[PDB]
Design a binder for this molecule. Structure first.
Ligand code: HEM
Length: 108
């Protein structure tokens, strides 16, 4: 790995202030701007039923792993050009560690 866990309580917060905006995490939460995150990891890109994902996302066939996801939150549009992720990224290794510790806990 190239991912080191961090603060789950730190993640929780980043995510509110940075992605709640368009997404929900709990099982049985709805899609909003972006898709619902429950059971993301180990899950392949663009596969939640009832959501219309860019053709970009869909063909990236990304395999969602803490590792995968970090590169991804860095700058998604570079990662998958054409995605309608309206997110410039988490420039910082730490915030990102924080968040995916979060995301790895809350989406499970
Ligand atoms: C905040 C740091 C943040 C997270 C975390 C996040 C996660 C994320 C993932 C992992 C996907 C891929 C989906 C898949 O099911 O395979 C994804 C997709 C989209 N997002 Fe998101 N996202 C974060 C930030 C933001 C913000 C702040 C918005 C809205 C302003 C947003 C929106 C979207 C959209 C739209 C998509 C789908 C893209 C496509 O089909 O190309 N995200 N999100």
């Amino acid at each position: 790995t190239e991912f080191k866990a961090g603060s789950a309580k730190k993640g929780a917060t980043l995510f509110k202030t940075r992605c709640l905006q368009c997404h929900t995490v709990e099982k049985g939460g709805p899609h909003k701007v972006g898709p619902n995150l429950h059971g993301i990891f180990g899950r392949h890109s663009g596969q939640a039923e009832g959501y219309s994902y860019t053709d970009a996302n869909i063909k990236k066939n990304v395999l969602w792993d803490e590792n995968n996801m970090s590169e991804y939150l860095t700058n998604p549009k570079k990662y998958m050009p054409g995605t309608k992720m309206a997110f410039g990224g988490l420039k910082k290794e730490k915030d990102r560690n924080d968040l995916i510790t979060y995301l790895k806990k809350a989406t499970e």
